[PDB]
Structure formats: C-alpha cells, structure tokens
Amino acid sequence: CPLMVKVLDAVRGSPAINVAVHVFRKAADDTWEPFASGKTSESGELHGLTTEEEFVEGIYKVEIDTKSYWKALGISPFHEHAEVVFTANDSGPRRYTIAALLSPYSYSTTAVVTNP
Amino acid sequence: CPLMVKVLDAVRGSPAINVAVHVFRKAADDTWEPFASGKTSESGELHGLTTEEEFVEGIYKVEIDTKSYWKALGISPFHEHAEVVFTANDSGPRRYTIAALLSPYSYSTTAVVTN
Amino acid sequence: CPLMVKVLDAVRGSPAINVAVHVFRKAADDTWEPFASGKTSESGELHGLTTEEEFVEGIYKVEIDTKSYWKALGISPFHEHAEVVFTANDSGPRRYTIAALLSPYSYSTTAVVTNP
Amino acid sequence: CPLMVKVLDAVRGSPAINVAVHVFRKAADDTWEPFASGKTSESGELHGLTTEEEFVEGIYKVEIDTKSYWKALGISPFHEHAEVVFTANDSGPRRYTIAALLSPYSYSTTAVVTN
Ligand SMILES: O=c1c(O[C@@H]2O[C@H](CO)[C@H](O)[C@H](O)[C@H]2O)c(-c2ccc(O)c(O)c2)oc2cc(O)cc(O)c12
C-alpha cells in the first residue's frame, strides 16, 4: 500500500482501534478535496486507502479523529483531531506510513517514507 | 495572556526561533478566520496573541510554519506545517500553553492548561 | 516473539538500522544481569531476543545505543543511550513491543503490551 | 542554574507536581554516585540542583520517578522510571534543561541547551 496509517494509545499501551481517518488532497482551486477514508483495525492500522496509480503528486491532509476515540473511553481530550499535512510523490512514487501516538492532552506524529 | 505558544527544535536542542505562527477561530460557516499571529522569539515563545476579553469559547487552530523553519536550516522536512486544533472551554483552567517539539519527519504537540 | 524492539529516525523518516540493543534483567542481588542483545534490521526491528520460557517475571532494562547511531551519521547527539526499564510478566506472560523514536536532542519511547 | 528539570503530564495537560528526581554522576569505577535530587514544584520544575562550580564535565543520569507519580493518580504505568543519560560538555551552551513529557505507557525527553 503506498499510504498506511498506524495509531497507538499511550495511556493503555495498545493499538488505537476503530479510529476514523479522513484523507484529503489539495485541488487545482486550493480547497481540500476528499481522497479516502477508513477506520483503524484491531492492530491500530489502516491499509487500502489508495493505489500507486490514484496516489499522484499533491498536498495531502490525513485527519485522525482522536476526540471521538478518547470520548468513547470516557476521556475529554484537548485536541479535536490530529492532522498531518504533507507533499507526497513530488520526486516520484514513495510509500508513506503516518504513525500517531495519542494521549488526552498530547499527540506525536511521525512519517516513515520508503522508496520501492 | 490566555494563549501562549512554545516551539523547540529536537535536532539542535534549542528553542525554535523566528517560526511563524498563525491562530484562526472557526466561524459559523465552518471556515477558519484569522485571529492572531506572530514569530517565535529567541526563547522559542510567542505571547501577546490575545486578551482574556477576546479569547472566548470556540474552536481554534494554531498553525506552526515548520516547513520554512527546516528549509532555513537546509534540512528536508516532511510536513507542510504543524496544526493544533482545540475547543477553548471556560469550565477549565484559564491559561493555554501549546508546546510543539519539532523534528524534520515528526512533531509532538502538548497542551499545558493552568489556573 | 514476547519482546520486540522497533527504532525509528525522526530526522530521516526511516527505520534506524544497525542500532545496538542490550537487554538486562535485575538479579536476586539487585544488579543488572545481561539477558539478551542484538542489532536492529533494515526495518528498524529486533526480533528473537528471547522465548516465552526464558522471559520470566522480573524487572528488565532495554538499552538502545542511540549515541553510536547518530555519530555514524555525523551527528553529535545529547543522550548516551535510550534506556527503557519495566516490570514484565507480573500478571502472566505478555508480548512487549518497545518502540523508540530518535532525534539528536530528544527521544520518545512507547510500549505496546498484548495478552496472547 | 546550569541544570534544570521540567516534567509535564500528557494525560491531565498539566505540570507533573511532586515527582521525585535523582541526578547521579558516573564515577571512575563506572558506578552512579548520588549528585543532587528533589521533587518537582507546582510548575513541574526542579531548579537549584547544582552550581556552575560543581557541574563539571562528565556523564550524568537524571532519574524521574514516573511510576510513583502514576500510582498516586490511580493509573497503571509501564515504566519503573524515566532515565536520561548524557555527557556535560564545556564546548556547548552553559544551561541544560531536561524536559520530560509523561504518559502511562510512553515518555519523551528533550534537552534544551542554551547560552
Ligand atoms: O522543553 C519543553 C518545555 O520547556 C521549555 O524549557 C526550555 C528552557 O530552556 C525552553 O527554552 C522553554 O522556555 C520552555 O518551553 C515545555 C513547557 C514547559 C512549561 C510550560 O508551561 C509549557 O507550556 C511547556 O514543554 C515541552 C513539551 C514537549 O513535548 C517537549 C519539550 O521539550 C518541552
């Protein structure tokens, strides 16, 4: 898969399961066009968002619904979401893993980029 | 100062100086309206963004221009910017510090909410 | 594997390859006894450190040689190592993944604990 | 103050108050000799650990007693403590801030080295 998202919970030491993820691509007219969406699995992973053919050069936004995640565990968290915005495929096709580590008042995000 | 931003550089172990920071407030039509902005100081800090009077409950976005920071250092970065989006709530403490720790391919953001 | 270590580099957006890892177990006499060691793979992962039979209850120390990693990329980093110290298997056998995200002046560590 | 420690709690969005902190210096026999210690303040900070005079080049360990902090809050933690191990170098800036961001199953530590 050229785009994978992996979400972990820093409070429980576990994958963050059933987290909603929305991917957008910046259009010709400079607005955020829907691109792909899905929910993390029991492993905290979301695969199958796109293909190398559909995943062209552009600016992409990955929006992870962290607030719904925490509310369902009884936690009122600080952030509305974790958003990752990046230029993709500008030097040709790459594989991108977007990792997010969640706490109620903090998150970190990291990208692992590989060249197939 | 109800809203402060602090930016650190995890590569140099230093404040992140002269980083542009834009704050937006979400309007009734769900667009982002410019609210406040500035550049981080030599201490990596930005204060004086707003007043108790104007910082009412609502949804706010803090955009940190990380890509320009890394480009100035000659380091290829991943993100276009770091965005922090949150609801300001009068039930909680009165002072919000948005801290960001920057690396070229990773950032972390934490909220410290006191008084 | 009941104990796995995964090391990422936050400067390059890549696995941290060939990182030395040393695991110790706190002995009867309260010193750190060598337990296992290895080097991360091209995926930044170290598997095969131990077995469920050898990996008994105890206090374990995972020591990741981050300073040698950065020096070989031409970086003089802040830390000597990243050390993760934890009680394991106290409520029965678990699977532990110790993840470390490295920057020259910062690191984070996270544990993912699963119950087989 | 050449050495300061700052601890934040990522679950509550607050300073981590009354956290024990022990600093050690590595001796010639490669054992850790007690150097300085204290409890974090209401601001999550510990200053006055050492003086410019006594903080000479060497290898130092800062141990943060995270497990007692989480136990006091009724939250099951993973780590026994967070350890930060580093060489103090006179070629670099003169002020070391060791920052730690705590979650029950994760911590991050950053060094901010200034002046
Ligand atoms: O280092 C960190 C830090 O403290 C810094 O200490 C240095 C002194 O030299 C700086 O220059 C600067 O003054 C100050 O920001 C704070 C912080 C403390 C108190 C607050 O109220 C607050 O909102 C944030 O949060 C962090 C969060 C991370 O995820 C990673 C970090 O490394 C830090």
How close are the terminal C-alpha atoms of chain D, in Å? 12
Radius of gyration of chain B (CA): 14
Asked if residue A35 is part of any domain, the answer here is: yes
Is A108's Cβ below 8 Å from some Cβ in D? yes
CA-based R_g, chain A, Å = 14
Residue A57 has, within 13 A of its CA and on its CB side, a CA count of 4
Longest CA–CA separation in chain C, Å? 44
Structure tokens at C43: 């995926």
CATH code assigned at D48: 2.60.40.180
Q: Which of D40, D54, D65, D39 is nearest to D88 (CA)?
A: D54
Three-state DSSP state, C69:
helix
Nearest to D37 by CA among D94, D90, D81, D89: D81
CA distance C16 to C3: 18
Instruction: With H, G, I as helix, E, B as strand and everything else as coil, classify residue C95.
Output: strand
Minimum distance, in Å, between the CA of residue B109 and any CA atom of chain D: 10
Query: Is there a contact between D26 and D60 (Cβ–Cβ < 8 Å)?
Result: yes
CB A46, CB A40: distance < 8 Å: yes
CA distance B26 to C110: 34
Dist. CA C39–CA C64, nearest whole Å: 9
Q: How far is C4 from chain B (nearest CA, A)?
A: 22
Q: Compute the distance between CA of residue A111 and CA of residue A98 in angstroms, rounded to an integer.
A: 5
CA separation for the pair C76, A40 (Å, rounded): 38
Structure tokens at B47: 């204060």
If residue A82 lies in a helix (H) or strand (E), which one and from where to where?
strand A79-88
Taking phi over 0 as left and psi of -120 to 50 as alpha, with beta for the rest, C30 belongs to left
Return the residue of D nearest to A79 by Cα.
D13
The token pair that represents C102 in the structure block = 């490295």
Q: Does B1 fall in a domain?
A: no
Q: Is residue C2 in a domain?
A: no
End-to-end CA distance of chain B, in Å? Answer: 12
CB atoms within 10 A of CB B115: 7
Amino acid found at C45: E
3-state secondary structure D17-66: CCCEEEEEEECCCCCEEEEEEEECCCCCEECCCCCCCCCCCEEEEEEECH
Handedness of CA D6, D12, D17, D21 (dihedral sign): negative
Question: Distances from the Cα of A35 to the Cαs of A25, A94, A113, B100, D52, in angstroms?
Answer: 6, 17, 20, 28, 56
Distances (CA, A) of C64 to B107, C114, D32, D41: 21, 22, 19, 31
How many domains does the structure of chain C reveal? 1
Tell me whether residue B17 is in a domain: yes
Residue D2 covered by a domain: no
Question: From CA C88, how far away is CA C114, in angstroms rounded?
Answer: 12
Q: Which two tokens stand for residue B62?
A: 């803090």
Please state whether C68 falls in left (phi above 0), alpha (psi between -120 and 50) or beta: alpha
From the CA of D99, how far away is ligand 1's center (Å)? 7
CA-nearest residue of chain B to C75? B11
Query: Between the CA of residue C21 and those of C35, C51, C82, D15, what are the distances in Å?
Result: 11, 17, 10, 32
Residues in B closer than 8 angstroms to C108, CB to CB, are: 108
Instruction: Quickly tell me which residue has 């552009």 as its tokens.
Output: A58
Query: Which residues of B are less than 8 Å from D101 in CB distance?
Result: 108, 110
Strands C95-103 and C3-9: parallel
What are A32's two structure tokens?
A: 């955020």
- CB nearest A87 (choices: B80, B107, B111): B80
SS3 A89: coil
Q: A-contacting residues of C 4-33, CB under 8 Å?
A: 8, 10, 13-15
> Hey, how many other C-beta atoms are within 10 angstroms of the C-beta on C71?
12
Residue D53 lies in a domain: yes
Mutation site, C45, C102, C109, C110, interface A, largest A CB count within 10 A: C110
Q: CB pairs below 8 Å between B and C: how many?
A: 38
Q: Given an 8 Å threshold on Cβ–Cβ distance, is C113 in contact with A14?
A: yes
Query: Which residues are CB-contacts of C91 (< 8 A; sequence separation ≥ 6)?
Result: none
Distances D104 to A18, B20, C116 between C-alpha atoms, Å:
21, 33, 21
Tokens of A16: 């963050």
**Domain containing residue D49:** 8-112
Q: Under DSSP, is residue D88 helix (H, G, I), strand (E, B) or coil?
A: strand
CA C5 to CA C2: how far, in whole Å?
A: 10
Q: Is the CB of residue B97 below 6 angstroms from any atom belonging to ligand 1?
A: yes
The sign one gets for the Cα dihedral D1, C104, D78, D16 is: positive
Residue type, D101: L
Give the neighbor-by-neighbor strand order of the sheet with C79-88.
C32-39, C20-26, C58-64, C79-88, D79-88, D58-64, D20-26, D32-39
Cα–ligand 1 centroid distance for B99 (angstroms): 7
For residue B45, give the 3-state DSSP assignment: strand
Residue C70, both tokens: 């950065």
Is A56 within the bounds of a domain? yes
CA nearest A30: which of B87, B35, B34, B80? B80
Q: Which residues of B touch D114 (CB under 8 A)?
A: 14-15
Distance of CA A22 to the CA centre of its chain: 7
- Tell me the two tokens of residue B88: 């300001």
Question: Can you tell me the distance from the alpha carbon of D1 to that of C94, in angstroms, rounded to the nearest whole number?
Answer: 43
Q: Which residues of chain C are within 8 Å of residue B105 when distances are taken between CB atoms? A: 9-13
